[PDB]
Every structure is written in C-alpha cells, then in structure tokens.
Amino acid sequence: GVIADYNYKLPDDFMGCVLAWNTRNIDATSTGNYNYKYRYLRHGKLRPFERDISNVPFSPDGKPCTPPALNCYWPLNDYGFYTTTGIGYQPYRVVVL
C-alpha cells in the first residue's frame, strides 16, 4: 500500500520480528501529534529494503515532475496521533529484525 511502495518496502521471503508496543502517552496528544509525516508520493515505487527521504516535489502516479506542473505536491502526508481516538489512529513504536 503506502508503507511498502512509498515509505519503506519489505521483501516477502525473510523477515524477522515486529516489536510493537503502545506509546499512546508518548507520541500522541489529544489534539493531534502533527509532528510526524510519511511518504505518499514518488516517481515510482521502491525495491525491497529501501529508504527514501527525498523532499523533491513529485507526482502520485509516478509522473516525472518539473514543478510547478501537473499533480506536483510535497512528498509527505500527516499522521495525526490522538489520545482521544481508537487504536487505528493511536501511535505504536515498531522495531523490525
């Protein structure tokens, strides 16, 4: 979806463990921890096990952008962590082996 092909991709053969715990009182705030972002936007997708922190403005459909032009925006989208939400909008912290 958006995590693998845009933020960081994992291969489907060998993966270690997902160390995930509940940091509701650490990262979140009931108005919204709007201090963290994630990629939704790149000229294409990633290979397995690949970082991408490119703040070049891109296109959501892999289209080559010479900005300002068609579908040219910023690569990063908000999270919005509340302490007054369900688990789907609460932060966890994940360590991957």
């Binding site: 290979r47 096990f49 690949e50 970082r51 991408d52």
Partner: protein, 191 residues
Amino acid sequence: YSNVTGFHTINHTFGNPVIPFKDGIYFAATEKSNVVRGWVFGSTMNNKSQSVIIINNSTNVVIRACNFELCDNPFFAVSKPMGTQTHTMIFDNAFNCTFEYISDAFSLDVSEKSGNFKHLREFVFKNKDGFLYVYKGYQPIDVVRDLPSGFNTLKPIFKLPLGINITNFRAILTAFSPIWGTSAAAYFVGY
C-alpha cells in the same frame, strides 16, 4: 557478446553523466593512471534522497551513505607536473548519514602514466533484497582502447546492506590539471 557502451575520457572529453542503474551494472575500468576512482549511487542525485558514495581517495576506500549535496561535476584534481592529488570536490553537504566505511591506510599511485592501459578492473553491482552487492575482478593487460575479449571470474568483496534508493549513478573521475584536463582512460556500462 552484448552491447557495451564505452565512455572514453580523452583530452577534451570528460564523460560522467547520470547513468541508469536499472537492474544492475558491469563496471569495467581500463586503467593506467587510476583516473576513475569513484561512483555515486542514488536516485535523485541530490541532497534530498539518500545516496551512497563509493570512492578510493588514494589513502582509503570510503563507503558513505548520507543525503549528499551532489556536486553536478564531482572530480578529483591531480597536479599533472607535481604528480599529487590536490582536490576532493565530491559533495558540499552530507546529512542523515546512514552508512560509513573507511578502509585501511595505504598509498596509491596518483601520477599520470603513459603508454598502454595497464590494469583492468571489473566491477558488478546489484541491489538485491536491499543489499548492495559489490563484486570485483582484476587482471592486467596492455592496450590502447577497445575492451578486450576475455574471461575472468569476479569475486564478492562487499555485501553492503545499505537499504537505499538506487536507480541512477555517476562515475567519479580524476581531472588532471597542469584549469581542468584529462588523460586517457575509459569505462564501460555493462547492463
């Protein structure tokens, strides 16, 4: 017997474009003066995305992954009459430095030679499961140009878990200044 693009570095010809990595590459190095000494592997080739630089700075072998502010013409400058390297004009800035390697200390032949291309270095690069597979071969020859027909097994030297975005690359040459200039070398693309 597949198509090999030859980029010659001759007197006015200083060829180091952004070359696609698409699935991996075969770097050949027809050398006599150790002109080609490095590469920059990235995708955006600027300070926004992560990129790795793999160089020999004639003292060490340095592998470093950061957000390098890539110089659009990265080069090492060697004084042609002095025989010494003068410049390290690689990047202006580096930040979010992800990987860092420096090899053992040595002293490399910096000087310009003449005659035929003395040594061939054969390099094969792959981005597989987020590793950076870097494989190596080496044998001596003596020829003027035209990458010779031959057979040599290449060996794994570095299984580099970088985990970065590599779709494009650029070789890092050496400019010989006696104000820029070259001497004769050539490198080869090898998809």
